[PDB]
Design a protein around this ligand. Sequence first.
Ligand SMILES: CC(C)(C)c1cccc(CN[C@H]2C[S@@](=O)C[C@@H](Cc3cc(F)c(N)c(OC(C(F)(F)F)C(F)(F)F)c3)[C@@H]2O)c1
Length: 377
Amino acid sequence: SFVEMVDNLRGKSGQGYYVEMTVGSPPQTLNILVDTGSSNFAVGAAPHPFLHRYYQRQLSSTYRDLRKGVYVPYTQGKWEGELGTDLVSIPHGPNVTVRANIAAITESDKFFINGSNWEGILGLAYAEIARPDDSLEPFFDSLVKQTHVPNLFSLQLCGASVGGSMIIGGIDHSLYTGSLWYTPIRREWYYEVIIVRVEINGQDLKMDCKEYNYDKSIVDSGTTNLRLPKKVFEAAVKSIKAASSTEKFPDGFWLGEQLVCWQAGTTPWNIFPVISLYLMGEVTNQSFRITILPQQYLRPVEDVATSQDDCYKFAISQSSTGTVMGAVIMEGFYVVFDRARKRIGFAVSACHVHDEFRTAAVEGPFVTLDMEDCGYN
Ligand SMILES: CC(C)(C)c1cccc(CN[C@H]2C[S@@](=O)C[C@@H](Cc3cc(F)c(N)c(OC(C(F)(F)F)C(F)(F)F)c3)[C@@H]2O)c1
């Protein structure tokens, strides 16, 4: 029954992927950002310059006030509001209705994005990181508890104005090619995984693998970039600089500030290396790798001048909260959040990114000793 959910995601580049939902009785329609990096379901519930519509609790006969406040600080942006519950549906999702916790957003700072076309956020990670605390049941937990929808979902985020699929309750085999490879969810709070090796253009970075997961590695559809811990970021940039030294770049480009352009159609893709992340596998001493093409970490942005060149921003950036595998890693992969079996699956997406002589890949098996030592404590 998954064909009804194919292509149920939309978005604008760098502004996230959202799915249509309805809340309340009668149903109020809102676009909701899908975010595996948080665990709160929250919606605009009051006028805001960037909102063209919002949730109106007074108009819903099924609304219940929980008479308790709440706020959530993200990396950038935050909101506060009122907790309550209401009936929620996903039109292009499973044919069910659930009563879910909803944070009605009454105030916010840099949360909503001008022109993003979404009015709320769907936190799909675990109760452990819910605000105010882990007793506030996340939406997907409610869905699974109240219905017969199996305890997993999958995301196919496609690049170029963007679209994708959130298959709720299963895996749609027409969305990927090749085999699915699975890495354990290390702990159910964020979708935390363990990176055991990193290579750039086939060359091992040769760092202590704990550095890759310091202080954690997570899969986060609410983040645009691949984000890397300071030491790893510097090693990666040094290596990517070396490989592309043929050309000169503004150092503000490597900081993700200045975009670089080339004459439309002449982007020197070949001088930018592929990046391979090796993830812990399902059996002893076994891992697998996902390989990212430059077409994924050089994100296309519109011309800041009058010309019609191809311009790009460097979409790898430094993190102080661990590795974040954001949308640009997830794009061109089919990612399965298999909560029931505590694992995340990766396969080459059907909407995979193209290079002339190179291809994004998910490959295994590999042997990797002492993978347990890669986890940071
Ligand atoms: C407390 C809590 C929630 C567990 C937490 C605190 C810090 C870091 C994290 C890890 N996950 C975070 C990383 S943060 O960069 C984005 C956040 C979700 C989010 C909040 C926002 F305000 C906005 N605008 C947003 O839109 C982005 C973008 F436009 F790129 F900003 C777009 F559009 F790309 F999606 C996305 C996600 O959840 C969780």
